[PDB]
Amino acid sequence: GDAFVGTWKLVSSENFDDYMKEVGVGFATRKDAGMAKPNMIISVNGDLVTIRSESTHKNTEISFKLGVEFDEITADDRKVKSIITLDGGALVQVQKWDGKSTTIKRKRDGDKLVVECVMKGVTSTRVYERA
Template sequence: MVEQFVGTWKMVSSENFDDYMKAIGVGFATRQVGNRTKPNLIMSVDDTGVVSLKSQSTFKTTEVKFKLNEEFDETTADDRKTRTVMTLENGKLIQKQTWDGKETSIEREIADGKLIAKCVMGDVVSVRTYVKDA
């Protein structure tokens, strides 16, 4: 289940994120901020199975609440309005966002005690790595 993802995660590296933001249509100014931002991810689950995923930084804090396999409306950190569904597949938390005929996915998995988030848009892939905050 999602319990392995629960906790506070600090970003330690981000590869190819500017190209990913370009691929999803983020403007220059927002990309400049996005490239400098090192957000914390805070994930929790309540008794009813609702998962909260919060991305917190000095620039912006966003939060989505969802149940696995149930589509919901999301406003992303770069202000896209998406239809999003989160699924758990082979231990990976997969976030699929669709908007304006486009689709991107963010695959999160725990590997060697780190949370690896792989952001994919077409053939552009960004990998962001987080470690658990003690």
């Protein structure tokens, strides 16, 4: 996934609070995660893809290989089973936990990176631009 590599900065976000509420993030956690404009750094070293989210308080990073299931502890402290694939040119991530599942799509749109998170009829869209 060479097209996703780079440092991305959040320039737009919609329905994110509603999305976190839907997945089950507590008001307090949902409050801090919301009151911050993350920095997304994506890099690939060999067959390993690393995605890192940086902010002035909460840092998280995941390392994985495409198509290989892995354990992930999310920003909101959820222990989930993730699988990331490259489908239709986009990185599609599926998080599974407690019989629930949510989809996170990262796609390139021109000079921007769009992240679409869907959970039970709720769609959150985050637009990032290259730093």
